[PDB]
């Protein structure tokens, strides 16, 4: 039934595809020493620099140890070679449900209980990963790789690996939707507050159902609008003056005026 190893054998690849990128294939997998089904991914290695690679392999052993309800659990990370080409295996916790983006796809508007809910589940894990020792920053933190655990389930924070491979200093080409960035994520200047931005523009996709600045066509239009302070069309469509007033104190311009994390749990909204 499988079609890959992990060396020790501790899991194995199937050949039944669950997601895709430019980069990344991800295949099911299997836990021998748990009996649990994981998330195989591949990563193709040609493509990862020697600066970004060894740091995958200092990274990995950090993001093992990290046990967080809030957080997708990894397990492990090595290199691979298929047929002919070069790969790096990601194995984190197999989440089937989904992510945000389809959940907001499947039901089109989100009810508030239920935003609250998870925003603050957000939030716990975001916590958790800036309390850790030294402190872990998302980078890369959007609604595809925030990862529902069921349709009434809370919300677990995925991606962790691929963070690192987030390339903002990188010139990447004009191809299907632009993604928005924080003002400093050009600059390579950054730190906690990078992903509070992250967080209020999550928040707002999960408000308004729709994505940040759909008005511009490419990343260059969405970069002159975020470093001037022209927020987005989609930032007027929200109908809670609460909700709205969170979200406009998370993307600000200047990551010194952004609210912290502690702030936002001892928040009116979020009790
Ligand atoms: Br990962």
Not at 153 to 176: Q, Y
């Amino acid at each position: 039934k499988a079609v890959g190893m992990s060396n020790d054998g501790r899991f194995l690849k199937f050949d039944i595809e669950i997601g895709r990128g430019s980069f990344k294939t991800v295949y099911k997998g299997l836990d021998t020493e748990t009996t649990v089904e994981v998330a195989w991914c591949e990563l193709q290695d040609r493509k990862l620099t020697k600066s970004e690679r060894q740091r995958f392999k200092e990274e990995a052993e950090m993001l093992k140890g990290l046990q967080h309800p809030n957080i997708v659990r990894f397990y492990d990370s090595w290199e691979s070679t298929v047929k002919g080409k070069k790969c790096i295996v990601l194995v984190t916790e197999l989440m089937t449900s989904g992510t945000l983006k389809t959940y907001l796809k499947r039901f089109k508007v989100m009810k508030i209980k239920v935003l609250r809910s998870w925003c603050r589940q957000i939030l716990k894990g975001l916590q958790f990963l800036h309390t850790r020792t030294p402190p872990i920053i998302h980078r890369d933190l959007k609604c595809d790789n925030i990862f529902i655990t069921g349709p009434t389930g809370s919300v677990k924070i995925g991606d962790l690996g691929l963070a690192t491979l987030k390339r903002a200093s990188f010139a990447k080409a004009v191809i299907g939707t632009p993604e928005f960035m924080a003002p400093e994520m050009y600059e390579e200047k950054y730190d906690e507050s990078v992903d509070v931005y992250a967080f209020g523009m999550c928040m707002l996709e999960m408000a308004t159902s729709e994505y940040p600045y759909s008005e511009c066509q490419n990343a260059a239009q969405i970069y002159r609008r975020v470093t001037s302070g022209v927020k987005p069309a989609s930032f007027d469509k929200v109908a809670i003056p609460e909700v709205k007033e969170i979200i406009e104190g998370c993307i600000r311009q200047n990551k010194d005026e952004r609210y912290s994390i502690k702030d936002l749990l001892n928040h009116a909204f979020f009790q």
